[PDB]
Design a protein around this ligand. Structure first.
Ligand SMILES: [Br-]
Ligand SMILES: [Br-]
Lengths: 138, 139, 138, 138
């Protein structure tokens, strides 16, 4: 029903990496990826882009050469998601603030003007046969 | 009076978490939370996402193993709430640029054409009256 | 010329403060604030929020327990500003692809509507004034 | 063709600084700029502002005291390039959310309108005939 529809995806991506991660790293890096609960703190810390490479990534990377793939793919993807959620909430915001509020009038101040043109139509009809019942009564 | 109302909710959160923070951690971390004034600067650093977990929160969590809920809830709450400030501003920014200005130039653009039709609407009724009299005066 | 009126202001504050902190701090921390051009860098990394407190301000604050006003002012101030190039480029951007081309496409559909409405106006007059003429001879 | 047009820019801005970095620091900073990949990563770490100054630039600046150029420039180049891809993505967002329909739904309203306002050019000319034959039938 709107944005929380990626907000689910984000939660899903997240939990996918916490498992992907505890499942490689818990072995040599308990403090970070030991428990599942472990893998999430560490991952939301990565999410905050606070000491992601220097603090967490680089120490794991020298242990597991390929471990960038994980950290980076994760940040790329996980941010590309939040980029949306954000934009989504921008749109979702101004769609309220303005657009809906204004469209309601562009329609209804154009209902008002549609009827205005109708009432002249009728008036010009009625007249128009009076004018040719001066041509039948003359 | 608008978004300025919400930056009161964000000054209350800092306070809720600072008293909460001094009253909790001061004893073992006089560094950060040992007074109020410091437990805010620590909260302002934790808000800027500067070292919040390596420098502050992962040390704290060593001594009280539950304090993550303190920091994860603070980053969330104190972030979501300055998403509102970066939004409501972003909007009442657009609002001045455009909406107020053009929105009013359509109120009037219709106003002016409304009167145009309400003037046409006139003559027409004027003409009817004239044909009507012409009608009666030869029956 | 608009946008860079804030960019010129930001350039200012960067300098206002840069002198500020070379004057106050350059003796106790020559590494960070030694020269002026040394604060120009250091305030650039404070601005991007990289180890600003824990590695710079907290260390200076130990020297001058009131320097936090120097740091917490700059953060707030240079933030609020940095925001408005973003909000400034946003606005001027939307402006390009949409806003400008809309007021034109609309003013001009209203000219036509106006003139169509004008023709009708004169047309009724002449018809009002044939019947004016006809009624006086009747 | 849009934003992946800017996506290549950011990719070719990286590529450049990457080779430039390795051909600059690879002698003294093996772990950071020891190879091309090495630098690509390190720059993503700098690009995400994660620990860039106390960790990379400052300790590098130590050996080449001009290096700030490289780091402070790459920051500004790449972060602006992301502000574009961002914006062109906020706008192409708005477009399909709102501006799409609201511009089509108004052309179709000024169709309705013009037609109505023409419908009565008709009546008003017809009536101007009947009344033109009341003036000659006299
Ligand atoms: Br709009
Ligand atoms: Br009309």
């Amino acid at each position: 029903p709107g944005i929380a529809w990626i907000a689910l995806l984000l939660l899903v991506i997240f939990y996918v990496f916490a498992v992907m991660g505890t499942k490689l790293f818990a072995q040599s890096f308990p403090e970070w990826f030991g428990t599942l609960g472990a893998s999430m703190y560490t991952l939301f810390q990565v999410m905050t882009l606070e000491s992601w490479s220097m603090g967490i990534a680089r120490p794991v990377i020298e242990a597991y050469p390929w471990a960038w793939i994980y950290f980076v793919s994760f940040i790329l993807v996980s941010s590309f998601t939040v980029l949306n959620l954000f934009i989504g909430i921008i749109i979702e915001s101004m769609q309220s603030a303005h657009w809906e509020a204004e469209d309601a009038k562009r329609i209804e101040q154009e209902q008002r003007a549609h009827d205005e043109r109708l009432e002249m139509l009728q008036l010009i009809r009625d007249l128009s046969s009076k004018v040719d019942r001066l041509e039948r009564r003359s």
